[PDB]
Amino acid sequence: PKEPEQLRKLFIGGLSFETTDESLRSHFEQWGTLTDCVVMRDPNTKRSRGFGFVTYATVEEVDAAMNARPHKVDGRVVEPKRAVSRGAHLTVKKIFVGGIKEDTEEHHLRDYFEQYGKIEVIEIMTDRGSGKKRGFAFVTFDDHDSVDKIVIQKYHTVNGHNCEVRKALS
């Protein structure tokens, strides 16, 4: 019933050194129930390390928090990202979509992937010499969270096809 905690956790970078567990929690509780909220501090000086983590009760709340960016916490714009899963580069805006075969068109990919975020480019790969569809595509979004949401899904079905999707980068 409950989603794995790893999927409900946000890493918040770029914190003001003034931010505390309490101020971070007061801010992010606006988008959901926080089961956990921590500002990372040096073990000796207790001076902030400039980042922390918050854990929501559900994935929908993570989505709501991500949709409410930019977040300005204690006067500083911070950088929320979903906890990882090791992938060679973390934060990217483009994905590889494979197993779409020759019958998949850009509207299939768009109609599906647009619900993950704003699409900027859809590039269906075609053979260099014949122009035949190669069975894969690249979608570029305006934001990395679209990609983070996509790649953590176990399945992707586009045009009846069960696709293999992964982060793509240069």
Swiss-Prot record:
What is the protein's given name? Heterogeneous nuclear ribonucleoprotein A1
MF terms per GO, please? DNA binding; G-rich strand telomeric DNA binding; identical protein binding; miRNA binding; pre-mRNA binding; protein domain specific binding; RNA binding; single-stranded DNA binding
Give the fragment's position in the full-length protein.
7 to 182 of 372
Query: Which species is listed as the source?
Result: Homo sapiens
Lineage of origin: Eukaryota, Metazoa, Chordata, Craniata, Vertebrata
Q: Where is this region: Globular A domain?
A: 1-86
Annotated Gene Ontology cellular components are:
catalytic step 2 spliceosome; cytoplasm; cytosol; extracellular exosome; membrane; nucleoplasm; nucleus; ribonucleoprotein complex
Q: What is its main location?
A: nucleus
Q: Oligomeric state and partners?
A: Identified in the spliceosome C complex. Identified in a IGF2BP1-dependent mRNP granule complex containing untranslated mRNAs. Interacts with SEPT6. Interacts with C9orf72. Interacts with KHDRBS1. Interacts with UBQLN2. Interacts with PPIA/CYPA. Interacts (via the RGG-box) with the HOXB-AS3 peptide; the interaction inhibits binding of HNRNPA1 to the intronic sequences flanking exon 9 of the PKM gene, preventing inclusion of exon 9 and promoting inclusion of exon 10 which suppresses formation of the PKM M2 isoform and promotes production of the M1 isoform.
Gene designation per UniProt? HNRNPA1
UniProtKB keywords: Acetylation, Amyotrophic lateral sclerosis, Cytoplasm, Disease variant, Host-virus interaction, Isopeptide bond, Methylation, mRNA processing, mRNA splicing, mRNA transport, Neurodegeneration, Nucleus, Phosphoprotein, Repeat, Ribonucleoprotein, RNA-binding, Spliceosome, Transport, Ubl conjugation
Q: How is it modified after translation?
A: Sumoylated.
